[PDB]
Design a protein around this motif. Structure first.
Motif, mmCIF file in Angstrom:
data_model
loop_
_atom_site.group_PDB
_atom_site.id
_atom_site.type_symbol
_atom_site.label_atom_id
_atom_site.label_comp_id
_atom_site.label_asym_id
_atom_site.label_seq_id
_atom_site.Cartn_x
_atom_site.Cartn_y
_atom_site.Cartn_z
ATOM 1 N N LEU A 52 5.297 80.336 1.919
ATOM 2 C CA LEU A 52 5.585 81.770 1.912
ATOM 3 C C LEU A 52 5.356 82.304 0.476
ATOM 4 O O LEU A 52 4.581 83.247 0.287
ATOM 5 C CB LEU A 52 7.009 82.079 2.331
ATOM 6 C CG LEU A 52 7.287 82.027 3.830
ATOM 7 C CD1 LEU A 52 8.582 82.704 4.073
ATOM 8 C CD2 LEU A 52 6.189 82.716 4.640
ATOM 9 N N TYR A 53 6.006 81.672 -0.512
ATOM 10 C CA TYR A 53 5.891 82.021 -1.917
ATOM 11 C C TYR A 53 5.936 80.756 -2.796
ATOM 12 O O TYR A 53 5.915 79.646 -2.289
ATOM 13 C CB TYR A 53 7.002 82.997 -2.286
ATOM 14 C CG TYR A 53 6.598 83.984 -3.366
ATOM 15 C CD1 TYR A 53 5.522 84.877 -3.163
ATOM 16 C CD2 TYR A 53 7.273 84.023 -4.599
ATOM 17 C CE1 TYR A 53 5.134 85.772 -4.157
ATOM 18 C CE2 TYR A 53 6.891 84.910 -5.606
ATOM 19 C CZ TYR A 53 5.826 85.778 -5.386
ATOM 20 O OH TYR A 53 5.443 86.623 -6.398
ATOM 21 N N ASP A 54 6.008 80.907 -4.108
ATOM 22 C CA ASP A 54 5.991 79.751 -5.006
ATOM 23 C C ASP A 54 6.814 78.514 -4.622
ATOM 24 O O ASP A 54 6.285 77.394 -4.488
ATOM 25 C CB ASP A 54 6.401 80.177 -6.414
ATOM 26 C CG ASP A 54 5.404 81.146 -7.073
ATOM 27 O OD1 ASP A 54 4.199 81.127 -6.720
ATOM 28 O OD2 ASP A 54 5.843 81.916 -7.972
ATOM 29 N N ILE A 75 4.938 86.852 4.221
ATOM 30 C CA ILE A 75 4.113 86.657 3.047
ATOM 31 C C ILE A 75 3.847 88.009 2.419
ATOM 32 O O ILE A 75 3.662 88.119 1.216
ATOM 33 C CB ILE A 75 2.785 86.006 3.408
ATOM 34 C CG1 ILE A 75 2.991 84.523 3.708
ATOM 35 C CG2 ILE A 75 1.800 86.174 2.280
ATOM 36 C CD1 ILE A 75 1.735 83.815 4.125
ATOM 37 N N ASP A 79 5.032 88.776 -1.449
ATOM 38 C CA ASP A 79 4.041 89.129 -2.418
ATOM 39 C C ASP A 79 4.378 90.477 -2.995
ATOM 40 O O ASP A 79 4.269 90.673 -4.226
ATOM 41 C CB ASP A 79 2.641 89.132 -1.803
ATOM 42 C CG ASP A 79 2.003 87.739 -1.793
ATOM 43 O OD1 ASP A 79 2.555 86.809 -2.419
ATOM 44 O OD2 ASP A 79 0.931 87.585 -1.162
ATOM 45 N N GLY A 82 7.399 90.325 -5.340
ATOM 46 C CA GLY A 82 7.077 89.643 -6.564
ATOM 47 C C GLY A 82 6.207 90.496 -7.484
ATOM 48 O O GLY A 82 6.155 90.272 -8.690
ATOM 49 N N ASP A 86 9.275 90.627 -10.526
ATOM 50 C CA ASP A 86 8.577 89.471 -11.079
ATOM 51 C C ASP A 86 8.655 88.315 -10.056
ATOM 52 O O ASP A 86 9.590 88.258 -9.249
ATOM 53 C CB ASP A 86 9.214 89.012 -12.395
ATOM 54 C CG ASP A 86 8.455 87.843 -13.014
ATOM 55 O OD1 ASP A 86 7.204 87.964 -13.088
ATOM 56 O OD2 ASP A 86 9.087 86.808 -13.408
ATOM 57 N N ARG A 87 7.701 87.388 -10.126
ATOM 58 C CA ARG A 87 7.693 86.251 -9.232
ATOM 59 C C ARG A 87 9.053 85.586 -9.093
ATOM 60 O O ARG A 87 9.485 85.239 -7.999
ATOM 61 C CB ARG A 87 6.658 85.261 -9.687
ATOM 62 C CG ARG A 87 5.317 85.876 -9.757
ATOM 63 C CD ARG A 87 4.249 84.832 -9.933
ATOM 64 N NE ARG A 87 3.981 84.118 -8.691
ATOM 65 C CZ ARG A 87 3.192 84.557 -7.701
ATOM 66 N NH1 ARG A 87 2.567 85.727 -7.797
ATOM 67 N NH2 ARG A 87 3.038 83.821 -6.591
ATOM 68 N N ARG A 88 9.760 85.497 -10.199
ATOM 69 C CA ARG A 88 11.059 84.829 -10.227
ATOM 70 C C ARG A 88 12.156 85.600 -9.534
ATOM 71 O O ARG A 88 13.284 85.147 -9.466
ATOM 72 C CB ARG A 88 11.475 84.582 -11.684
ATOM 73 C CG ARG A 88 12.016 83.209 -12.010
ATOM 74 C CD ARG A 88 10.884 82.189 -12.128
ATOM 75 N NE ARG A 88 11.165 81.101 -13.079
ATOM 76 C CZ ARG A 88 12.372 80.563 -13.305
ATOM 77 N NH1 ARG A 88 13.469 80.993 -12.663
ATOM 78 N NH2 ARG A 88 12.476 79.561 -14.170
ATOM 79 N N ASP A 89 11.855 86.773 -9.033
ATOM 80 C CA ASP A 89 12.912 87.540 -8.388
ATOM 81 C C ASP A 89 12.898 87.355 -6.880
ATOM 82 O O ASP A 89 13.826 87.815 -6.200
ATOM 83 C CB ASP A 89 12.800 89.040 -8.712
ATOM 84 C CG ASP A 89 13.226 89.381 -10.147
ATOM 85 O OD1 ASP A 89 14.453 89.396 -10.415
ATOM 86 O OD2 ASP A 89 12.326 89.630 -10.998
ATOM 87 N N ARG A 204 4.266 75.302 -10.388
ATOM 88 C CA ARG A 204 4.390 76.636 -9.805
ATOM 89 C C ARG A 204 4.373 76.672 -8.287
ATOM 90 O O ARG A 204 5.336 77.103 -7.659
ATOM 91 C CB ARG A 204 3.320 77.581 -10.349
ATOM 92 C CG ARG A 204 3.461 79.000 -9.817
ATOM 93 C CD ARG A 204 2.489 79.958 -10.477
ATOM 94 N NE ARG A 204 1.104 79.593 -10.216
ATOM 95 C CZ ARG A 204 0.394 80.054 -9.194
ATOM 96 N NH1 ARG A 204 0.941 80.899 -8.334
ATOM 97 N NH2 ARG A 204 -0.863 79.666 -9.033
ATOM 98 N N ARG A 205 3.275 76.217 -7.697
ATOM 99 C CA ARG A 205 3.178 76.219 -6.249
ATOM 100 C C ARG A 205 3.680 74.891 -5.724
ATOM 101 O O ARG A 205 2.973 73.887 -5.722
ATOM 102 C CB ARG A 205 1.741 76.485 -5.803
ATOM 103 C CG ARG A 205 1.255 77.882 -6.139
ATOM 104 C CD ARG A 205 -0.202 78.080 -5.781
ATOM 105 N NE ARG A 205 -0.395 78.401 -4.371
ATOM 106 C CZ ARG A 205 -1.574 78.684 -3.829
ATOM 107 N NH1 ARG A 205 -2.664 78.686 -4.578
ATOM 108 N NH2 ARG A 205 -1.667 78.964 -2.537
#
Lengths: 220, 249, 222, 250, 217, 250, 252, 250
Positions: A52-54, A75, A79, A82, A86-89, A204-205
């Protein structure tokens, strides 16, 4: 007049259970590696386990067109959050909460409810040390926070107990895989199995599919 | 369509009127610098309309959450609307999601508010913000402090220099800090340097007001370290001011 | 199936709701010297049945999660928006409860299925003021109740309610109140890992809501 | 679909025609306001001009808008009159719907939104610059309870630390006068005199501001507000104060 | 009368099943040449087998106006994706996944479901070496990944078994053609034939007609 | 309403505010890219200017956007960082939705649409001119696999068969420099030198392009991409290549 | 609505973004394209240069494309716009064929291209200009010899089926046309037509700096396509280079 | 209201098809039409120009649009052709839907609406000035049956009682010529001679109108219409008439 709610409730609920019960099964469990996904899947083109995400994975059982539709929408939500932040959220908890709202609404407002059951799993970020999180979301939108493993699809009790009896808190990937395979066979080979894992080690992934040769090796 | 837990996004959808989109009262100088284990930010109190002084008590630096503050320069009205809204946007996400935004998400969110004001800024309702924060998640506490500047199009930059400023006297303040920075070794020396850079800006820019002894009005400041963001007490600044004044005599 | 009369529909709808609630985890909210205490049994660590709505206004619910998370978010939108259009001090627990009543009331009457939820909106006084906390319970039907000392929702209440009524103390200290609440919860049938605890602390200057977790909670328990 | 309990937000939604915004109109006024212990006072002139012609000599520009506040508006007369009526309704509307009046800060914020939402029309001359005077019941100290708030054209608002403020074509003259006379304010009578005097001075240096007309008997209008609420000052008490100032200047 | 959720599905489902049962049959099978399409079809103007994209073929059985409709939308979807990205990004898997979503929705929301069953087949690109792919999508919206052949329309079991017993992985087109025809007759100008060919550089699809078809047999 | 599985197409339909939809700003950059046997390298300066003032000295303009591609964007700084982020999400979004990455040609086409859809904003000065560098796994020859693509403001794209290209305010200088230095490119290290040299030359003749700052130790950023994927060149390796050049010019 | 089996409309109805409708409230351009009819055939060729003001922005640009088995299009104008049109028109043609099982009549293919052009007038007024030349072989024509077709389009979509026997578009088109006016009588077959074409393009490059002629140092030459009863084919580079050197040594 | 209109139908379904545009081109033409007893004849030149350059020399501008009518169009070449094609479909469409052709008055009115709905585009250069010639079967007298109708850019139409009319860049010359030659019309042969001569005279004084090309053998095109319907006059018959006129001028 209106129509009977208890009646509608019951019939719609029964219809969903039957579709899922007749479906292929999937298990997800925590491990030292992080989270392991195993599902019985004859087909080679149709996935039941996806990224789904990182650090967030997805597994489902039920009618394919229906859960592939949910995988995509998920997804899209990840996306988008993020990107806006940010991606981390982006978190597993959030994806699960969304699916709950969604299945909950489909259940109540659509023609037919969704014959699906799903799992959203999240491992920790590269370097962090956080216990893996597993969520199960029902066709009616119910949501559960699972500590060690989740089972969905077909007939579960056998598979569930089988796992309840043999679960290990920090199993090696091979051992955990064997245990999962055992529960699945027990519940009801490389060709018949779809496998992937959320790997904490990956920077990361986290999502990785274990296929062919490598899978066979891991299996035995 | 897709919920983002964004208060501003919600406002346009249900309450467009609340959304913000000469001459007007404008002009400010704001500085911000990093000291070990901390960041400090300060701004002047003047507001002008042409050559006339329209305000002398204006506060332009606000604590926007426990670990961040924002200082805004430009049209005073648009700059104050921005601080309030941005603080609500930040706390709204926290209550909806039970966890505060990562520092990078807080920056990205501010950048979107700024950028979405470009049209308005072209017509004079400009708002150029400076963001100062301490990042709890940062690997090292000493390097925890953050300073981020925004250009009118929303472009943001995290300063690797150690200080930054915005506003009509910003060049003077920056040149001043360029010389005084090496003296910053802690929160007190760092606060001194900030008040001095603001003194220097008021010296060369009529739009930036310096400390007023007669009325007891002084720049406002905010310091932020691992224990969170706190307003410096006026008195603390006043005595940092006289120190500089007396030292210049 | 077969269509029924409106009177019949209310009864059915009404039942459908009562069952869903009666079948869910329980929550208690009670006044204390500290202000207001929130205790619910949550095996879940991530899921929240207790949340902050505004500065001095808290929320707790029981029922179907997706359904009360939905109402939790709407309330936060309503409060933030009113606080922005006027001032933070103009947002009240009374207003948030009045809203939920209107909402549940409409969902009940117009939605496919009613909401299987029961909720409580609690408000403590502003830093420095001295005002008796306020507790409101809002039913699936949308009916609203003004509770003087405590509120109980979720699962089987009578036991918890009576037990709570018997042991309730008006000025109970935070520790005593928490213990009493846990005991009351037990009558409906409890450690830091099966509990969700938080308070609306009147002592705090602005944001009253605080979650009591792990170590700190454990010490409070015993 | 978020209920604001806002009369104006209701209006935009249902009956936009009633809203003020549109698109040489009569204009020009001088309005002053100052704080005296336990009180605040506000006064405005009565003239209206179109170019060089005097279009009005009885215009009232200061209105009590609720029990503890008053607003004085400078700008196009048509715009100012509309804003005052509407603001008073907006205030009482929220009180009836919610059973409780808005906090002072909420009243300010509301006025600011009305002003800011007129910025486009202001750029085209339909300018309304308001001054708000109020007494805050919930303020910690009764003596310092009185509040003065000014608004810039973009809705920016400022609470006045200085003690006095003015808006309109003669505002600079009025403000410079109060700067000198302010120390003489010790109560509502001394503060009221300092107010009418500042308006006298504005009329002296600005042809757009009318001073006391002794032939027709038209004088500035004033409102005073203390803990007991807002009152219109009676004409004769102002006429009296005007004659004092006049006699005293000659 | 009125019916229940579980009921409604059986009815819809049945209605569909009958309509498909009552239509002409089609087979698609893997071969050395790539993919072969054979359908019993009396008409000379109405196709049951079509090209979707470069290396992607389509075959259907059921109500014509209904599957012509789906053929068109699949051509629109493929052309659009090949334009927005590149031709090489368009895959059979994607077209199949779209049809599944579509039939799935028609089945659940339309007054009547679609009486159709379809096959999406993809051969490799000129020069590549990839095993053909075949997918069957039911009226229900169910999707299946078939390794060697697919059968749809009318009564299948016979045709299916007939093929199961005689299927060969690397059969020549003539041989494969003969095997397919045999299976088709068991199921029972009047025959429609086309192939997806790996040898073709860009457009794999080709209709085998008249004299060439007769010779091949 | 066909689903193209496009993240931006999704944003447009449901989240327009997120998109840099568009109706002096920092700018000025020089980006170069060249092909070496079995590889592609790309580098960009660190300067940002507003008029004559230096607004930034650490700006990063070259970003790895997926395992086999990088994008360097020249033009208005604001508009360029956003473009790289968005494009990277667009690429990974298609991969997760379709389980397979876009073909190189597809990636190019997607970027061109983003560019072309900004022409209106670019007319107003929110210009973004990108350069795309990638290695194609699918391509038959690994040595000649490397790819360089430039875009004009209307979205037109060209695949450069020359082996080098540049964009930004100093791009002419950088391209003339590479025209002479290119024959010296025989592997990834020579190609990266030539790249850092072309950028040095651009900084020498264009005040908007910053060259290597030895005082603060800020250097151009670079990315190299071969069959093993895209990698950020480490600062130190660039710093050493810079000294080499400086040393050699003295 | 009425379905037209038009890929363009469908894009317009659901995918406005994909469409090169980039018209809003110096880009690379400049090319010369020629086309002529020979018995039982047609040939089309175009230069490779692209310019931005005085600067040469491209030297390898391909401007002539086979759009279906019996047609090709050459577009001169803005480079970005022209390339987009060529890809779109080819999809529009193959889209109708798959939907209807039969290719468009030649007249239908013309009409369709004219609508795409005409719908770009507003953007062309703004510098996004693409002016196409269409070359095709009409199978349905009674005479195979007279089958070849050349069609030109003005900026408003007006189209004209060339009766002269040759046509050109682009910045060097006057030169190319004047050249063919003299060389045309020498055209008797595909090869002589292909020579005339490369010469007319040579003459255009001689008098127009925006049109590039044969680059012997880098070995870049015009691209050409020839179309007869057996369909459209790209002429091979070497055959053109050969033909180029012949003209060059012959001018010297 | 279904009007049985092909254009009105496109308008609500497929605007893209419609010629009309909103938001230099080839043009120029001379078209004449005259009434002869029991008949009407119409002719047009073959030239097309862009500025001073001759862009076309074979252009046909006169078309039989139905069994009893023809239209000749002047102005922008693209627009005129689109108009002629569309008008003919519009006519046949009403006939098929209603089983009966439109009355002559109705055909005029329909063309007028198409013209008028193009005025905005005409203001921007996409001008189309049509001339309509027809024979009315339902007319009381066969000799008087012939009709000529001209349209101004706003759709205003006029039925010509003078006996002849012309449109286009050389129309003044053609009309002055017919004014002198008209009395010589006594039948379709003489009438076609005057028409070809009026067009010859227009070509003589206007460089945008082309006259008979004897080297290439291109001549004006003509259509004649009597009780037996509309027919294209054959080329040779016109060429011969042209030579007679040329010979006669020498």
């Amino acid at each position: 007049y209106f129509i009977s709610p208890e009646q509608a409730m019951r019939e719609r609920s029964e219809l969903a259970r039957k579709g899922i019960a007749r479906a292929k099964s999937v298990v997800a469990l925590a491990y030292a590696g992080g989270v392991l996904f195993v599902a019985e899947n004859p087909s080679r083109s149709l996935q039941k386990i996806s990224e789904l995400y990182d650090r967030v994975g997805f597994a489902a059982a039920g009618k394919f067109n229906e859960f592939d539709n949910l995988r995509r929408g998920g997804i899209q939500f990840a996306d988008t959050r993020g990107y806006a932040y940010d991606r981390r959220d982006v978190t597993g908890r959030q994806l699960a909460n969304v699916y709950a709202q969604t299945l909950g609404t489909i259940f109540t407002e659509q023609a037919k409810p969704y014959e699906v059951e799903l799992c959203v799993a999240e491992v920790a970020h590269y370097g962090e040390t956080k216990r893996p999180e597993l969520y199960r979301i029902t066709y009616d939108g119910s949501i559960a926070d699972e500590p060690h493993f989740v089972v969905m699809g077909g007939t579960t009790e056998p598979i569930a107990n089988a796992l309840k009896e043999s679960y290990a808190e920090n199993a090696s990937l091979t051992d955990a895989l064997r245990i999962a395979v055992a529960a699945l066979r027990a519940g009801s080979g490389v060709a018949s199995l779809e496998v992937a894992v959320l790997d904490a080690n990956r920077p990361r992934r986290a999502f990785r599919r274990i296929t062919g040769s490598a899978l066979q090796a891991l299996l035995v | 369509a897709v919920d983002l837990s964004s208060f501003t996004d919600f406002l346009r959808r249900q309450a467009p009127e609340l959304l913000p989109a000469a001459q007007l009262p404008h002009g400010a100088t704001i500085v911000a610098l990093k000291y070990p284990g901390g960041v400090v930010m300060a701004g002047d109190r003047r507001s002008t309309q042409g050559n006339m002084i329209s305000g002398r008590d204006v506060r332009k630096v606000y604590i926007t959450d426990d670990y961040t503050a924002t200082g805004i320069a430009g049209t005073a009205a648009v700059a104050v609307e921005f601080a309030r809204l941005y603080a609500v946007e930040l706390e709204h996400y926290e209550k909806l999601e039970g966890v505060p935004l990562t520092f990078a998400g807080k920056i990205n969110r501010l950048a979107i508010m700024v950028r979405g004001n470009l049209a308005a800024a072209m017509q004079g309702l400009l708002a150029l913000p400076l963001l100062a924060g301490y990042d709890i998640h940062a690997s090292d506490p000493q390097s925890a402090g953050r300073i981020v500047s925004f250009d009118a199009a929303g472009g943001w930059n995290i300063e690797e220099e150690g200080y930054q400023a915005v506003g009509s006297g910003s060049l003077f303040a920056k040149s001043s800090m360029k010389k005084l920075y090496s003296q910053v070794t802690d929160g007190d020396s760092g606060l001194r340097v900030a008040v001095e850079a603001l003194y220097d800006a008021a010296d060369d820019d009529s739009a930036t007001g310096g400390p007023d002894l007669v009325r007891g009005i002084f720049p406002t400041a905010v310091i932020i370290d691992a224990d969170g963001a706190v307003d410096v007490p006026e008195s603390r600044i006043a005595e940092l001011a006289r120190a500089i004044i007396e030292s210049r005599s």
